Paper text:
During anaerobic degradation of the PAH model compound naphthalene, 2-naphthoyl-CoA reductase (NCR) reduces 2-naphthoyl-CoA (NCoA) to 5,6-dihydro-2-naphthoyl-CoA (DHNCoA). The architecture of NCR clearly reveals a spatial separation between electron uptake at the FAD near the surface and substrate reduction at the deeply buried active site FMN cofactor. The two flavins are electronically connected via a [4Fe–4S] cluster with edge to edge distances of 6 Å to FMN and 9 Å to FAD, respectively.
The NCoA structure in complex with the substrate NCoA and the product DHNCoA were determined at 2.2 and 2.4 Å resolutions, respectively. No significant conformational changes were found between the two binary NCR complex structures and between them and the substrate-/product-free NCR as documented in rms deviations of 0.45 and 0.49 Å, respectively. Reduction of NCR by excess of the two-electron donor DHNCoA (exergonic reverse reaction) was incomplete, and the neutral flavin SQ remained close to maximum intensity. Together with results obtained in titrations with dithionite, this finding indicates that FMN readily accepts a hydride from DHNCoA, and the FMNH− formed reduces the FAD and the [4Fe–4S]2+ cluster by single electrons, each.
Residue numbers in the entry: 13 to 672
Write the structure that this text describes.
């Protein structure tokens, strides 16, 4: 099947079994106190190695405390980090994967002070905990604090720290070393004309701006030797107004190959300060491949690998075939499904847990100093915890799952994988629950890949799927199961709003279910995630939409990465919104509201959508007590409304606990 993706390839002197690479992923799994590698991180990458990835890269390791940009970033500074580095390398090498250590000083994005650093040594002198860069300056956004200009001594020092960091990797069994010179970290800071305002040998012309990177490459090449694999990550476009152009990054790449032999180029897209889209669902697989074509036609000697929304094996396969790239790199797809490679080379892509790009468990959690997690993969960060082990339990109990939503299908999938006699009751004609409806939203198209997954596991696990069957207090008893899993989900709320009983009112479910004939002027009462996403679907059809939020901001329950995603879309669709508005009435023509200080104002509309919240659809659960079956359980939104992430987690936490 996926012949090209499974082809071998030599990276330097080391042969790689396939063309699938798991990219560096800082996940705060390391000890936040000192940057040492711990079991959580060891078992995390071990599973990615077991999964079949021909290459597994560690997270970006910080070469200096001032370069720590994540509360739990791996450290590459002192000898106290060697035991963990050797253990992690062996875990990856044992699985037949090429282990590669990444060296990453965050530079301008450092948060040493936020992590409790009062003072540090740099260039033989005491300094403050502020981040460092080639030029002292402030960030346009508040996340990154003002940086300090690096003395020429600190620059020479960091060249050595990279050399030493490469040594720590090689001497601990790592099969290769990767230099991280992307998205806005220290090296990228010197390469960019926007952040590098220096006039000495380290700044000015494109040659001087790239001197820092070249000296890091030359220094490491001498340290590791001509045989050791040396690769790097370099932007192909930084998406920064005033930064470097696409052809400049190509020229920089040429300079790197002229200085040392580059074994592999990982070309990236954008900076954390870029106002454009680089990794959100807005971008589809294959959109950035045109940048790879530029590097290939320009004569780049080393092979190239790319990622950034390349969550489709089909697209990657065609890419490797056409020579656009030489390796299919990926980070989020490797998080969502550690066994994606094994599933690809075994001709079973239908079993892939695809990445939806929710950016909640991975990007968002890591930037808020939290343990990384995954929406579709509840094992991320728990690969070490025996509580998530999947045990057989030869008893084989009879399990009845009520609700084919995400939580219900995750509970049944595992219970079936463990040998239980699972059955699912669905009152509708299709599985998916609210995911079946959200997939209609423009930015959630990936949710179709999720439906496919569960639809394929049910068909492969021989699970009893009873579609068009509304579970009642009688059918359950008739089925007489050993364990009852109630996953009815949630339903739209209906607050006490004068006139809410008017015909002009409708809820989210009816909209996405086509059980309503809307018009051209629509108004949504509620600025939460679900409400906004529903409006996007309404506007996509060519209709005027307005969102009314009583709170201070819209998209209040949206992660910081997706906030920028809705703005670009709500604006592209010409959508209006209002905050701090009081809902006073809903009549035939629309909804009457009031701002701060009276200011009564009507909103003429053809359809008013009450989408302020969701209610737990716990009707059935409360009708059948905990005595109807030897073991009764409620999971998902019916046991308390949460989001999709907490639903799949509840399902898997339930599928592995069904002992009897
Ligand atoms: C999520 C942010 C990183 C910042 O978060 P935050 O909202 O908390 O920043 P801040 O609070 O300081 O910003 C305040 C205001 O500016 C807005 N803002 C923040 N970042 C913005 C931005 N980039 N453009 C426009 N507005 C922005 C933000 O919406 C907010 O609006 P307001 O308070 O309501 O008035 C944001 O900049 C952002 O979404 N960046 C996009 C990330 C991105 O695409 N990076 C390039 C591709 S990712 C990549 O290749 C990569 C490589 C290596 C990595 C290693 C470690 C971890 C991840 C890595 C990713
Ligand atoms: C439009 C929309 C967009 C959303 N976007 C996001 C998002 O971006 N991020 C996020 O985290 N969350 C999002 N959510 C929320 C997320 O979809 C839910 O949290 C999640 O689907 C809850 O899963 P569940 O299995 O607990 O319930 P559900 O998904 O609602 O599953 C319930 C299923 O059980 C069936 N059922 C109910 N009662 C019975 C019965 N008596 N007998 C048989 N079958 C029954 C229902 O028909 C349904 O198929 C969105 C929701 C909507 C509606
Ligand atoms: C949580 C998280 C941590 C990341 N850590 C690193 C890192 O340490 N070094 C690096 O070069 N890229 C890092 N990245 C960027 C990814 O390696 C990858 O290039 C990017 O997320 C887009 O690729 P993808 O679409 O396959 O996810 C990280 C991304 C995420 C979401
Ligand atoms: S949390 Fe979302 S974006 Fe991150 S890996 Fe999982 S599915 Fe992909």
């Amino acid at each position: 099947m996926y012949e090209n993706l499974c082809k071998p390839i030599k990276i330097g002197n080391h042969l790689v079994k396939n063309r699938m690479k798991y990219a560096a992923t800082v996940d705060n799994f390391c000890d936040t106190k000192n940057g040492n590698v711990i079991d959580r991180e060891i078992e995390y990458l071990r599973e990615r190695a077991k999964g079949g990835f021909g290459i597994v890269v560690s997270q970006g390791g910080y070469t200096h405390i001032l370069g720590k940009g994540y509360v739990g970033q791996m450290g590459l500074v002192e000898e106290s980090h060697l035991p963990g580095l050797k253990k992690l390398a062996d875990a990856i090498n044992a699985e037949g994967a090429m282990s590669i250590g990444q060296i990453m000083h965050t530079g301008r994005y450092g948060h040493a002070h936020e992590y409790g650093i009062h003072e540090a040594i740099a260039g033989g002198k005491t300094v403050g905990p502020e981040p460092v860069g080639p030029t002292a300056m402030s960030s346009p956004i508040k996340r990154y604090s003002p940086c300090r200009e690096m003395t020429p001594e600190e620059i020479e020092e960091q060249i050595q720290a990279h050399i030493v960091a490469a040594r720590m990797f090689k001497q601990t069994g790592w099969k290769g070393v990767e230099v991280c010179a992307i998205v806005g970290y220290l090296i990228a800071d010197f390469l960019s004309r926007w952040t590098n305002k220096r006039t000495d040998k380290w700044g000015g012309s494109l040659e001087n701006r790239a001197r820092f990177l070249i000296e890091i490459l030359k220094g490491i090449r001498k340290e590791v030797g001509d045989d050791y694999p040396l690769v790097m990550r370099l932007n192909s476009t930084d998406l920064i107004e005033g930064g470097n152009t696409d052809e400049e990054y190509i020229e920089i790449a040429k300079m790197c190959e002229a200085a040392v032999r580059i074994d592999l180029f990982s070309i990236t897209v954008g900076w954390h300060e870029s106002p454009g889209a680089a990794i959100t669902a807005e971008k589809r697989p294959g959109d950035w491949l045109h940048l790879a074509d530029n590097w290939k036609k320009a004569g780049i000697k080393a092979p190239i690998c790319m990622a950034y929304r390349m969550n489709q094996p089909d697209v990657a396969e065609k890419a490797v075939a056409e020579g656009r790239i030489d390796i299919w790199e990926m980070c989020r797809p490797g998080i969502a499904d550690p066994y994606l490679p094994k599933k690809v080379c075994e001709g079973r892509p239908e079993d892939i847990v695809t990445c939806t790009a929710c950016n909640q468990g991975c990007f968002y959690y890591v930037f808020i100093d939290a343990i990384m997690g995954c929406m579709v993969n509840p094992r991320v960060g728990n690969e070490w915890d025996p509580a998530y082990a999947i045990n057989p339990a030869a008893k084989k109990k009879k399990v009845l799952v009520v609700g084919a939503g995400p939580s219900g299908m995750e509970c049944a999938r595992l219970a079936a994988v463990r040998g239980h006699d699972v059955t699912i009751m669905e009152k509708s004609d299709s599985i998916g629950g609210e995911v079946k409806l959200g997939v209609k939203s423009p930015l959630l198209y990936d949710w179709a890949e999720t439906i496919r997954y569960y639809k394929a596991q049910i068909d492969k696990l021989g699970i009893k799927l009873k579609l068009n069957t509304e579970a009642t207090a009688d059918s359950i008893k008739a089925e007489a199961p050993d364990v009852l899993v109630i996953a009815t989900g949630g339903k739209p709320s209906r607050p006490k709003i004068e006139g809410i009983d008017n015909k002009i009112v409708t809820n989210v479910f009816d909209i996405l279910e086509g059980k309503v004939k809307l018009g051209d002027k629509v108004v949504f009462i509620g600025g939460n995630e679900i409400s906004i996403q529903t409006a996007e679907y309404v506007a996509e059809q060519g209709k005027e939409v307005t969102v009314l939020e009583k709170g201070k901001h819209i998209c209040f329950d949206v992660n910081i990465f997706n906030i920028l995603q809705h703005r670009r879309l709500m604006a592209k669709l010409n959508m209006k919104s209002m905050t701090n508005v009081t809902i006073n009435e809903i009549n035939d023509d629309g909804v009457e509201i009031s701002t701060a200080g009276g200011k009564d104002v009507t909103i003429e509309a053809d359809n008013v959508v009450v989408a302020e919240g969701m209610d737990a659809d716990d009707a059935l659960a409360k009708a059948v007590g905990t005595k109807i079956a030897p073991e009764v359980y409620s999971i998902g939104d019916c046991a308390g409304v949460r989001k999709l992430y907490e639903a799949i987690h509840d399902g898997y936490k339930m599928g592995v606990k069904i002992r009897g």
